[PDB]
C-alpha cells in the first residue's frame, strides 16, 4: 500500500500550514502523524485521524476524507520547523506504512543569496595523481540550491558529488560540490566552471589550470 506526501512545504510565521497525505481509500484506515526534528526521536502528534495526545498544543489538528488525510498546524511558530510523517496499518499486506515525509520550513528569516568559492586542485593533490575541484556555497536562504558543472562551455555530470544543504552557525545554509578529474583531464581544458542556482538567480565561478 502507498502513502505519498509533498516533499516540501513552507509558511510564514503566525500563518497556517497544511500537510497532505495521499493514499487511496485512506479514509477507511486510521491515520497517525509524527514530527521529527533533525537528529532526534520522532514524536506522536495526531493519532486516530483527528485525536491529539495531551502534552502537545491545540494548534495541531487532523482531517481524513476519501482520498486524502491532512495534518493542519495553525499559528505556526519557529519551533514547528521539522519533518512530518503520516502512518497507517495495512491489514492487507501486514505492513506498517510511513509516507515520504514533508519538511516544513518556517520562513523565519530574510532571503539571502549564496556566496560561491571555487578551488582548483592543489599542487599537492596533483602530485598524488588525482585532481579535485571543490565548490563551496554558503550563507544562503532558504536552503535549496542547484549545482551544475561545465568544462570550457559544455556541461558534464560524470564524477560530480553534491552535498545536501545544511544549517551553519547562523541558521543560513551551505552546500558543497566536488568535481573529480584526472590530472590529464584537468590540464587538457581551457577552464572549468561551477554554476549555482538559487531561487531563480544563477551565480558562476570559473578556474583555469593555467593560473591561480
Amino acid at each position: 500500500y502507498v502513502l505519498t506526501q509533498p516533499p516540501s512545504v513552507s509558511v510564514a510565521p503566525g500563518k497556517t500550514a497544511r500537510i497532505t497525505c495521499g493514499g487511496n481509500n485512506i479514509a477507511n484506515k486510521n491515520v497517525h502523524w509524527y514530527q521529527q526534528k533533525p537528529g532526534q526521536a520522532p514524536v506522536l502528534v495526531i493519532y486516530y485521524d483527528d485525536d491529539r495526545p495531551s502534552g502537545i498544543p491545540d494548534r495541531f489538528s487532523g482531517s481524513n476524507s476519501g482520498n486524502t488525510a491532512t495534518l493542519t498546524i495553525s499559528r505556526v511558530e519557529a519551533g514547528d520547523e521539522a519533518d512530518y510523517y503520516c502512518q497507517v496499518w495495512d491489514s492487507n499486506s501486514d505492513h506498517v506504512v510511513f509516507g515520504g515525509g514533508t519538511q516544513l520550513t518556517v520562513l523565519g528569516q530574510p532571503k539571502a543569496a549564496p556566496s560561491v568559492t571555487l578551488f582548483p586542485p592543489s599542487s599537492e593533490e596533483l602530485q598524488a595523481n588525482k585532481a579535485t575541484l571543490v565548490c563551496l556555497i554558503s550563507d544562503f536562504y532558504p536552503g535549496a540550491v542547484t549545482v551544475a558543472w561545465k568544462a570550457d562551455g559544455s556541461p558534464v555530470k560524470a564524477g560530480v558529488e553534491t552535498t545536501k544543504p545544511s544549517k551553519q552557525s547562523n541558521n543560513k545554509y551551505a552546500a558543497s560540490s566536488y568535481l573529480s578529474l584526472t590530472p590529464e583531464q584537468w590540464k587538457s581544458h581551457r577552464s572549468y566552471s561551477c554554476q549555482v542556482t538559487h531561487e531563480g538567480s544563477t551565480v558562476e565561478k570559473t578556474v583555469a589550470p593555467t593560473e591561480c
Binding site: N30, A41, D83, V96, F98, G100, L136, S176
Partner: protein, 228 residues
C-alpha cells in the same frame, strides 16, 4: 516515563551479520508490542518489523523478509533484531519503538489491532560497506589573491566521522565544516573553510586540525597562500 536504548550498531561488510538490541523501562514491557523502524541517513522513515508481547503476531517488511529476525526476552525488557545477509541498502539509523497496543474484539470477526508508535529510542547506527578503516588524506585549499576564503580538503577516509578545528580551537569565527560526501570508492570526503581578513594573510597563520578517531589518526596542516 518511557525509555528505550538501542545498541550494537556498527560497520559490516555486505553479506555479514549484526545483532541490534534495545532496552526498555518506564512501561510494562510484558504487555507491549514492539517495532523496529529504520531511517536511511537524510531520507525518511521505513518500517522494518513488529512483534507482539509473546511472539504471537510477528510481521516483517518485504525488504528484509527472510534476512531479518525480530525477538524478545520479557524477563530482560529487551528487544532484539537479527540482521543476516546484509546489503548496503540496509545502511541506516535503526530505531526501536513501543506501540500503544490498542486492540478490539468481536466474537465472530476475531481480533483487530491498530498499530502505531507511542515512544521511540534515540537510535543506533548501522553501516554496511565493502571498505575498511582508513585515515584521511589532508589537502590545502589555498586562498587565491574585502575578505578571502581558505580551507582543507579531507579526502578518502572511512568510517565516519571526521572532526575539524582551526588553530587548535582558537579560531571559530568564520569557520564552516561541511557534511561528507560518500564517493564510488566507498570512501568519505569532506571540506572545511574559514573566511578571513584578506589583509592579514601574510601575517596571521592558519592551521587546520583534522581528527579521525576510528583510525586513531590526527593531522595538522598549515594552509598558506599559493606562489604562482
Amino acid at each position: 516515563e518511557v525509555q528505550l536504548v538501542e545498541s550494537g550498531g556498527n560497520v559490516v561488510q555486505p553479506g555479514g551479520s549484526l545483532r541490534l538490541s534495545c532496552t526498555a523501562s518506564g512501561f510494562s514491557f510484558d504487555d507491549s508490542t514492539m517495532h523496529w523502524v529504520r531511517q536511511a541517513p537524510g531520507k525518511g522513515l521505513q518500517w522494518v518489523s513488529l512483534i507482539s508481547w509473546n511472539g504471537g503476531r510477528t510481521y516483517y517488511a518485504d525488504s528484509v523478509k527472510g534476512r531479518f529476525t525480530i525477538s524478545r526476552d520479557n524477563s530482560k525488557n529487551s528487544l532484539y533484531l537479527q540482521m543476516n545477509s546484509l546489503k548496503t541498502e540496509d545502511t541506516a539509523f535503526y530505531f526501536c519503538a513501543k506501540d500503544k497496543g490498542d486492540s478490539d474484539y468481536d466474537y465472530n470477526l476475531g481480533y483487530s489491532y491498530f498499530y502505531y508508535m507511542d515512544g521511540w529510542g534515540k537510535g543506533t547506527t548501522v553501516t554496511v560497506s565493502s571498505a575498511s578503516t582508513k585515515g584521511p588524506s589532508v589537502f590545502p585549499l589555498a586562498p587565491s589573491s574585502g575578505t578571502a576564503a581558505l580551507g582543507c580538503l579531507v579526502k578518502d577516509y572511512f568510517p565516519e566521522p571526521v572532526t575539524v578545528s582551526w588553530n587548535s580551537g582558537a579560531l571559530t569565527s568564520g569557520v564552516h565544516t561541511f557534511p561528507a560526501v560518500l564517493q564510488s570508492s566507498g570512501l568519505y570526503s569532506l571540506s572545511s573553510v574559514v573566511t578571513v581578513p584578506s589583509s592579514s594573510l601574510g601575517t596571521q597563520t592558519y592551521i587546520c586540525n583534522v581528527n579521525h578517531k576510528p583510525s586513531n589518526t590526527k593531522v595538522d596542516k598549515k594552509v598558506e597562500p599559493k606562489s604562482c
